[PDB]
Amino acid sequence: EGRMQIDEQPGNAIGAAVEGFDHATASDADIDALKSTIYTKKIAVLKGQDLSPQQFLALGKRLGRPEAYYEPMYQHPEVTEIFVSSNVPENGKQIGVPKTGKFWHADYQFMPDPFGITLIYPQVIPEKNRGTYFIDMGRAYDRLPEDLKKEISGTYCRHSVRKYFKIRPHDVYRPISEIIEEVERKTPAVVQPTTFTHPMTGETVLYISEGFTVGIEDQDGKPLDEELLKRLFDATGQLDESFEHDNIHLQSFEQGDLLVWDNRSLIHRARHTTTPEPTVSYRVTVHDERKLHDGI
Numbered sequence: 001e002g003r004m005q006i007d008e009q010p011g012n013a014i015g016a017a018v019e020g021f022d023h024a025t026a027s028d029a030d031i032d033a034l035k036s037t038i039y040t041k042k043i044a045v046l047k048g049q050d051l052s053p054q055q056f057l058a059l060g061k062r063l064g065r066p067e068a069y070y071e072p073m074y075q076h077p078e079v080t081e082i083f084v085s086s087n088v089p090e091n092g093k094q095i096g097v098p099k100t101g102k103f104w105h106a107d108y109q110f111m112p113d114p115f116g117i118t119l120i121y122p123q124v125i126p127e128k129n130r131g132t133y134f135i136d137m138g139r140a141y142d143r144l145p146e147d148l149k150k151e152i153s154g155t156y157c158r159h160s161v162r163k164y165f166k167i168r169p170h171d172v173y174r175p176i177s178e179i180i181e182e183v184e185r186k187t188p189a190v191v192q193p194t195t196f197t198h199p200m201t202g203e204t205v206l207y208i209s210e211g212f213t214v215g216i217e218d219q220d221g222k223p224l225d226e227e228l229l230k231r232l233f234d235a236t237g238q239l240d241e242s243f244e245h246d247n248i249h250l251q252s253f254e255q256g257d258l259l260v261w262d263n264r265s266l267i268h269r270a271r272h273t274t275t276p277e278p279t280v281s282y283r284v285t286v287h288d289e290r291k292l293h294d295g296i
């Protein structure tokens with residue numbers, strides 16, 4: 001219908017708030033405007049969302065084609081397409097996986113065909129130590145020194161989940177070498193251009209993350225020294241354990257908020273566990289009408 005209102009942050013400031021959005025009744029033009037906001041303001045916060053797990057998936061389906069997480073221990077017991085980050089037991093049982101994403105990453109960056117849009121529906125929000133950190137890697141690329149842009153021009157990076165693969169209940173008593181090899185078979189390292197062109201905005205995106213990017217190689221596929229990756233992590237703010245770097249944005253939320261963000265441009269990371277406050281979050285990840293980049 002006609003009372004969804006989008007309030008974009010002024011200028012080049014990241015973020016936008018969306019009032020009066022109803023996924024069941026929003027028009028085609030509403031969805032078109034919401035997606036444009038996601039690609040340009042990078043983070044759209046839908047306000048006043050009171051959804052069941054099934055309704056959350058229905059909302060995600062308005063934006064794109066959902067993909068379920070490839071490791072099923074993360075999946076919601078009713079809705080396979082919902083990724084559950086939770087350290088609150090439900091009737092004594094562990095739902096989803098606790099303490100996820102404690103590292104800089106873009107979602108499915110270790111996979112050959114990553115999705116363009118991530119949706120997060122916080123269920124239990126810490127009172128004090130709430131929020132998620134973000135870095136716009138297109139803005140971060142633009143702010144690099146010109147020579148550093150030159151150095152990565154024409155290079156490729158390898159992305160792998162081999163550092164942050166989480167042990168599963170059925171992995172107990174297995175030799176660790178056998179899990180390490182299984183991960184390399186199941187999810188081999190993915191080669192991508194170090195930078196790619198955003199299909200929706202045309203921006204140049206620096207598609208690296210401290211958590212998943214394990215190597216960089218030249219225009220001929222010969223590995224380059226990892227010091228280059230360290231200098232790129234350092235320049236974009238990914239090594240600042242104080243989180244005060246100018247590139248870093250802390251996105252807070254309140255009950256009823258639903259975060260929808262550009263999974264091409266942004267990397268993100270959970271806060272330090274400086275308090276014992278718990279986190280429960282539902283995630284839906286959808287493919288939109290373009291691949292992550294033209295080379296996929």
Ligand SMILES: C[C@H](CC(=O)O)NCC(=O)O
Pocket residue numbers: 097099100101102105106107108109161164165166
């Ligand atoms: C390794 C992470 C999950 C986690 O932090 O356990 N993957 C999230 C994703 O890439 O979609």
Ligand SMILES: [Cl-]
Pocket residue numbers: 158160189214215
């Ligand atoms: Cl590798």
Ligand SMILES: [Cl-]
Pocket residue numbers: 243271272274
């Ligand atoms: Cl923190």
